[PDB]
């Protein structure tokens, strides 16, 4: 059950201790390298194009609506525990990308295939059993968080606000999905490279616009978040179920910490060493949770700090859009616009995430099947009725989570050695 979350967060605590709080010092260099200009050494696409591919998958409706779901049920204090999910989760994502160095390219051009299902093959053979298990789960799990959750949320959210959108929104999402992922990951890095920054800057500015117009409410909005999350007034640590569980559960969903489905893209990077790309991948959490998610959470609390009528019982994506429309002139149109690119980005990314993990099982023979399936399920997901899809999504993600976490625990000795190699190169 939910014990996996204590396991997932536990690795974050563990690796941070074993890696000695690496994330705080390496972050600026990693950030500069991630967006640095000019490198071609055995890879499918750039370091930057790898990050934007991963961020495309990492940024999704969980950033828009998944936070709202946590804000309502877990209270505003869930944001702080979403932060804890990312900060300690940085160490997890780094270990994921480092161990992605034990990757072998596949036939049918370089394409390259790296991921936790491969680590386990290079573990201490049982690993062959864990890796094929990981691929079995992830091949399915991509349809949940990566396809159906994102494609349904936009379809319905567009129907509420613009309403001339039955399946039409599903059709356009499928066509634009096939066009990009037709040209494999090389096409993705092109599309995800242009889309993601335009997407993130569009949003983030509107949030900083909202913060600008309501400067005074900023620090109290932080206050209610910190006052909550540590509000033991009710129950002996019974906020575990209220704020902490929803913060962690929805936090892992947005930034994708201990899931083992984040490096799938880092492997395609043109990287000299694991540490070169693994530092760029560690920024996956930071941009999602501490930046994008925090922007969403700040508006939500600010709406709650204000009065505003009728938003008290709003489901999720509609709440945030209403929270934006309340504070900004066209904030409602902004959020629903962002939701389209936020979800579409995540469709393309997790397609590759599922492709390479699928091909582990069947080889490149069925790669054509996975893509056409992903396109069709994207269409069906917008039309079908998936009210509790998030619930079945989180279960698949947890199923994916169990094996990879075991590897990161066991292979901590490998990375800490491999880290002491790269940081030695970092003095030259």
């Amino acid at each position, epitope marked *: 059950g939910p014990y996996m979350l204590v396991l997932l967060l536990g690795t974050g605590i563990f690796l941070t201790l074993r890696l000695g709080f690496m994330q705080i010092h390496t972050l600026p260099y990693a950030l500069k390298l991630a967006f640095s200009k000019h490198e071609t050494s055995e890879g499918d696409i750039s370091h930057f194009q790898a990050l934007m591919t991963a961020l495309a998958a990492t940024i999704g409706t969980g950033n828009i609506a998944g936070v709202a779901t946590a804000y*309502v*049920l877990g209270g505003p204090g869930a944001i702080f525990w979403m932060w804890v999910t990312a900060f300690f989760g940085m160490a997890t994502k780094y270990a994921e990308a480092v161990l992605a160095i034990k990757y072998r390219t596949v036939d049918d051009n370089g394409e390259m295939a790296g991921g936790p299902m491969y680590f386990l093959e290079k573990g201490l053979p049982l690993g062959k059993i864990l890796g094929v298990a990981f691929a079995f789960f992830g091949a399915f799990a991509a349809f949940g968080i990566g396809n159906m959750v994102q494609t*349904n949320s936009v*379809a*319905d959210a567009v*129907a*509420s*606000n613009f*309403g001339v959108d039955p399946l039409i929104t599903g059709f356009v999402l499928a066509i634009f999905t096939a066009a990009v992922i037709l040209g494999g990951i090389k096409s993705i890095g092109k599309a995800t490279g242009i889309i993601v920054p335009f997407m993130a800057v569009f949003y983030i500015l509107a949030g900083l616009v909202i913060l600008a117009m309501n400067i005074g409410y900023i620090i109290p909005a932080f206050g209610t978040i910190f006052s909550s999350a540590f509000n033991f007034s*009710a*129950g002996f640590g*019974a906020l575990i*179920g*209220t704020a902490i*569980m929803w913060g962690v559960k929805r936090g892992v969903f947005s930034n994708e910490a201990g899931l083992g489905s984040a490096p799938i893209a880092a492997a395609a990077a043109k990287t000299d060493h694991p540490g070169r790309q693994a530092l760029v991948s560690m920024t996956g959490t930071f941009l999602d949770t501490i930046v994008v998610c925090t922007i969403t959470g700040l508006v939500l609390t600010i709406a709650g700090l204000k009065a505003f009528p*009728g938003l*008290t*019982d*709003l*489901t999720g994506a*509609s709440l945030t859009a*209403a929270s934006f429309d309340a504070l900004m002139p066209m904030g409602g149109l902004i959020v629903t616009i962002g939701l389209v690119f936020f979800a579409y980005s995540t469709v393309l990314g997790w397609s590759y995430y599922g492709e390479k993990c699928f091909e582990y099982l069947i080889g490149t023979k069925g790669i054509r099947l996975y893509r056409i399936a992903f396109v069709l399920v994207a269409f069906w997901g917008a039309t*079908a*009725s*998936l*009210p*509790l899809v998030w*619930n079945i999504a989180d279960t698949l993600n947890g199923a994916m989570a169990i094996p990879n976490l075991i590897g990161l625990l066991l292979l901590s000795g490998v990375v800490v050695s491999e880290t002491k190699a790269f940081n030695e190169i970092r003095k030259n």
Partner: antibody
Amino acid sequence: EVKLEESGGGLVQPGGSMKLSCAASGFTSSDFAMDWVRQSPEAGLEWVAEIAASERHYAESVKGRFTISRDDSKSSVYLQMNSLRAEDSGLYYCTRTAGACGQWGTGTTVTVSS
Amino acid sequence: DIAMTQSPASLSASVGETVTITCRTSENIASALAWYQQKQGKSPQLLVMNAKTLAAGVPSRFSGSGSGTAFSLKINSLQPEDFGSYSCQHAAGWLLTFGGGTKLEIKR
């Protein structure tokens, strides 16, 4: 303030069908997800159907015999019942959902008997 | 299915006293429990949301507490206007279930 007026109740024989309606006002029907809650003549209070603007969920007791629908253009929610049973007798209430049922409706009455 | 059993099924309170009503559930449901008050010829009236949080416009005498496997609705200084049925509801999932009800009557 907010308005929810149910309508369409009546007397219908077993196996028959009818559709209920809930004209809504005072807010934005499109943004909020809606529910149908029914109370039997013995104060049962049983949940019936859910909808948001696209997808729907049903209680197992009525799955396949009820169809919840929505028309945000006309700001009204519907509940279509077919193959009705005696147990479907109750006051059918309209409401909007999320975690708690805050704004409820007037109620409309269904009697299923031969 | 989550089964919520309320006790006492019915009670009579001498006016001006304090009373406590219980809603007990089959499985842990965190803080997702809500309370209603219903009168003759009326829909349920929300009294307390999310176990303890307070709905606006409901008098301060009403207070609810608990989490998980113990919930209580507490009324301080009853009044004749509190005559009715009190129902509890949970928000675990989307098939929200209700309690059997508790009938509040007045002593004379």
